[PDB]
């Protein structure tokens, strides 16, 4: 079968596959990431994500936990800055009460003050653990040192805001950012019919569009963090294309040309122009890749390096020089064809799993209200052509950069030197 995406007049779009698979999954996609926050509610989103277990105006936290557990179902709340999605997974027989629990959570939080209060200690941890991988700190700092207002807001709650987030604020967010028109309910394992018959009840309530989407403004800059780690992490990005343009496809082809993760375990990722350009000069251990994060109004594209503090300089320079070569037209058509094959294989393996398929449909829904068959994409990625890739490169090599560095930064260069 195929998804059938239908936009209920309330604005919510319903879509299902009913693969008749054993464990059906259903997820609500609501544009409610930190992006949609503002300066005085920093943190609301984080808590909201960890507070999927607070008594709902219809169910006790106890039942919520026990109920979902009993049926073996699972409710998870992923969240990016551009958006956020709640997801329930389970047996086709128990997904009626799973939709009861999920739709109660999404549309009716009691946000009891005592309850929310109990969570702020759990909040410290998340923001904390997620930072184990230095990468997190970097990407966060990066999106921050790079943007001014909207996409600069962190995914994790700041240290001063813990103890200050109140139930009111949370409720405020939902009623404001979590409205119907900004949501979409995609379900794999259910009948499109019922989705309409269980959303027409709870979701169509918040009919308004919702708080305006704060636009995002680029700022440039660099934030560094001397913390004495063994490895220097450094991300250097610039402004790039947004969601909904062919230049975003050009930038995706550009990161798969430059290198977007190893395909072989213990490989050296030989092809990566970056990896090759670093490895021809530096014998130290390193990890150089291309970073691309595009949101519906703005995108960041650049390079990400992990290296020994000492070599941190020229390695970064070598990586930067490689991108400048791509900005000068120094590329081959076989390399671009291999980059396109890598990108399309990555897309197909991303959508080959059930939860990735449900997320993709979800994202497409909120983003364009339409479903784009995997096939369609393949021919559009093919549309990207060599010159297009080169173009995106020059955008990066010219646009003001934003640099987030961490480690022993005694030999890490600056932007005016880079």
């Amino acid at each position: 079968q195929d998804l059938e995406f239908t936009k209920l007049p309330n604005g919510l779009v319903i879509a299902s596959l009913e693969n008749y698979a054993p464990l059906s999954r259903i997820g609500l996609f609501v544009k409610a990431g930190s992006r949609y926050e503002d300066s005085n509610n920093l943190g609301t989103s984080h808590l909201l994500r960890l507070a999927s277990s607070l008594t709902t105006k219809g169910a006790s936290s106890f039942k919520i936990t026990r109920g979902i557990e009993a049926v073996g179902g699972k409710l998870s709340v992923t969240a990016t800055r551009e958006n956020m999605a709640y997801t329930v997974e389970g047996i086709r027989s128990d997904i009626e009460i799973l939709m009861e629990f999920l739709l109660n959570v999404t549309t009716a939080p009691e946000f009891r003050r005592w309850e929310v209060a109990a969570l702020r200690s759990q909040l410290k941890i998340d923001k904390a653990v997620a930072f184990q991988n230095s990468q997190t700190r970097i990407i966060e700092n990066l999106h921050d040192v790079a943007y001014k207002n909207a996409l600069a807001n962190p995914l994790y709650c700041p240290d001063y805001r813990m103890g200050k987030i109140t139930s009111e604020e949370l409720h405020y967010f939902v009623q404001n950012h979590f409205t119907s028109a900004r949501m979409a309910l995609v379900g794999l394992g259910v009948s499109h019919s019922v989705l309409k018959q269980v959303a027409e009840q709870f979701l169509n309530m918040r009919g308004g569009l919702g708080l305006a989407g704060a636009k995002a403004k680029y700022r440039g800059g660099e934030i560094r963090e001397q913390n004495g780690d063994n490895l220097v992490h450094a991300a250097i990005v610039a402004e790039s294309a947004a969601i909904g343009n062919a230049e975003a496809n050009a930038f995706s082809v550009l990161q798969h040309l430059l290198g977007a993760g190893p395909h072989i375990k213990r490989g050296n990722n030989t092809t990566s122009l970056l990896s090759q350009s670093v490895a021809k000069g530096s014998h130290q251990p390193f990890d150089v890749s291309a970073f691309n994060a595009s949101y519906s109004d703005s995108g960041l594209f650049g390079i990400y390096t992990i290296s020994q503090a000492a070599a941190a300089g020229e390695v970064i320079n070598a990586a930067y020089n490689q991108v400048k070569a791509v900005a000068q037209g120094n590329l081959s058509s076989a390399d671009v064809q291999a980059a396109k094959n890598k990108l399309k294989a990555g897309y197909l393996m991303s959508v080959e799993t059930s939860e990735g398929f449900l997320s993709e449909i979800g994202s497409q829904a909120l983003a364009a209200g339409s479903y784009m068959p995997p096939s369609t994409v393949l021919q559009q990625i093919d549309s990207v052509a060599d010159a297009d890739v080169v173009k995106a490169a020059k955008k990066f090599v010219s646009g003001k950069k934003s640099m987030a560095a961490s480690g022993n930064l005694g030999h890490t260069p600056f932007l005016d030197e880079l």
Binding site: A79, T80, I125, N133, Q135, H143, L155, F291, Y304, I306
Partner: peptide, 28 residues
């Protein structure tokens, strides 16, 4: 101590993940 502690460099945006299930983490 980041409660219960655990190198691959991030190349994609991050996505927090928490919920009823015990596991909870972030991916690039």
């Amino acid at each position: 101590v980041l409660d219960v502690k655990r190198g691959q460099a991030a190349a994609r945006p991050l996505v927090a993940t928490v919920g009823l299930n015990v596991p909870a983490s972030v991916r690039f």
